[PDB]
Amino acid sequence: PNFSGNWKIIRSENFEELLKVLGVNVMLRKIAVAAASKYAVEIKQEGDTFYIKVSTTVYTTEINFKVGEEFEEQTVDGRPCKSLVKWESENKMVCEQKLLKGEGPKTSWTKELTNDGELILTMTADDVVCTQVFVRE
Ligand SMILES: *C/C=C(C)/C=C/C=C(C)/C=C/C1=C(C)CCCC1(C)C
């Protein structure tokens, strides 16, 4: 697996619907969909250690984890969570999340490197799955 690279988004499906499940009101959902059309993901992978920087026009966030080791990040709508990533196959990993405080939809994400050289991210809230596709810059 070489997830390492600078990835730029080419497709985003069901992102508004995901944010809706997560309780974001309609005007902000539209504004967020618009910010997603631009966004980039930078990955540095060494073995099962990952560094990920996600950036839009005005905001940037870093995720650091090792596969199989609990870490803390935030859900899509911004609520702090405990996360745990496991491999599902050679080139796909899955992250399950648990809220630090309170309750809400069951969230997760996956990241896959396809044979055609695309990165596929999925983000899930309950029954709704957002799929985003990236290519290397
Ligand atoms: C492996 C890559 C991951 C886990 C990327 C996660 C990216 C997000 C959770 C970004 C979500 C966004 C918003 C919450 C609002 C603006 C649009 C996005 C897509 C940057």
Closest CA to 126 of 91, 76, 82: 76
Residue minimizing CA distance to atom 4 of ligand 1: 109
Q: For residues 32 and 136, is the Cβ–Cβ distance under 8 A?
A: no
Residue 97, exposed/middle/buried by CB under 10 A (0-12, 13-18, 19+)? buried
How far is it, in rounded angstroms, from Cα 75 to Cα 77? 5
Q: In one letter, which amino acid is 135?
A: V
Cα 54 to averaged position of ligand 1 atoms, centre (Å):
7
Number of domains in the chain: 1
CA distance 35 to 57: 7
Q: How far apart are CA 103 and CA 56, in angstroms?
A: 28
The number of the ligand 1 atom at minimal distance from the alpha carbon of 78 is: 14
Q: By three-state DSSP, how is residue 91 classified? A: coil
Tell me which residue range forms the domain holding 135.
Answer: 1-137
Number of C-beta neighbours around residue 91 at 10 A: 16
Cα 44 from Cα 27, distance rounded (Å): 34
Does ligand 1 have an atom closer than 6 angstroms to the CB of 54?
yes
Residue nearest to atom 11 of ligand 1 (CA): 76
**Which amino acid, one-letter code, is at 18?**
L
With a 6 Å cutoff on the Cβ, whether 41 touches ligand 1 is yes
Radius of gyration of the chain (CA): 14
- Taking Cα atoms as reference points, which of 90, 99, 92, 93 lies closest to residue 125? 99
User: For position 74, which CATH number holds?
Assistant: 2.40.128.20
Instruction: Decide: 2 and 109 in contact? Cβ < 8 Å.
Output: no
Determine the 3-state secondary structure of 24 from DSSP: coil
